[PDB]
Homo-oligomer: 114 residues x 3
């Protein structure tokens, strides 16, 4: 799986250990092996949500399966919880796009997962 967060929160407000926490929590939530979990945080962005520049985030979670109605609800609770707790972003100022990737459309280690 791959989780990306873009946010206008400044770099200094990202606590140490945030990438590790995201990695461990995503392995717990997705059931995917932790060795395959990638995480990416992009602070200091020029963004607005509903016309306002208060803290917000635009995120993506890609996975080969483990995507669906109930699962996404659970990932959203988890990830909004983390963004609230660690980055002080309101959950109603966060969007997360979920992608169920086909194995044939994910390249890794000179090949694909197909």
């Amino acid at each position: 799986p791959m989780f990306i967060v873009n946010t206008n929160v400044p770099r200094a407000s990202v606590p140490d250990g945030f990438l590790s926490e995201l990695t461990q929590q995503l392995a717990q939530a997705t059931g995917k092996p932790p060795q395959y979990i990638a995480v990416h945080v992009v602070p200091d962005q020029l963004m607005a949500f509903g016309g306002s520049s208060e803290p917000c985030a635009l995120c993506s979670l890609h996975s080969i399966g483990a995507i669906g109605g109930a699962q996404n609800r659970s990932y959203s609770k988890l990830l909004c919880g983390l963004l609230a707790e660690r980055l002080r972003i309101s959950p109603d100022r966060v969007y997360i796009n979920y992608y169920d990737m086909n194995a044939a459309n994910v390249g890794w280690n000179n090949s694909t997962f197909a």
Copy 2:
């Protein structure tokens, strides 16, 4: 809806008000309330378009519906127009990927839109 722009144009060339203008104009174009519109502008990027470094932009618009043949043509005219007028980017050096997102695949406020 979510609009993201990545460009090699420098930060200083993004004018005051650009995020707010995108927000208002996307609310109009998509027929969605502005409170639901998120915008994200990323200047200073290392990018080329057609094997040259002149101004260009790589963009994404994600929306739960309001995506389709005619509507996307209309968004492209609108958005290329804004990128030309405000950032001085030639419309023939802009790509916009459109994504019709399923409500179950968009997280917000600790759940999804499903």
Copy 3:
């Protein structure tokens, strides 16, 4: 086609002709004129792969067609090759998400490709 690389490798480690190399190699691989190829490299990122902050990359290739099982395997070999050779990223620490875009969903030059 559009190829985007996000990486924790520092900017100084991206060799000066890397965007041009990517452009020429992708034109060759995809069979498309280089004028249609856009390339975008984002160094100095806060990211981890498998919990580790050793060099890694999270990438995307979008194309209207020229995407599929065999082709994506070939692109993955090519692109992991290039990242290993030029950025010193291990191929087992690179993800490339492939997107076969519908022409109606790609904006360009005030319209779409439809």
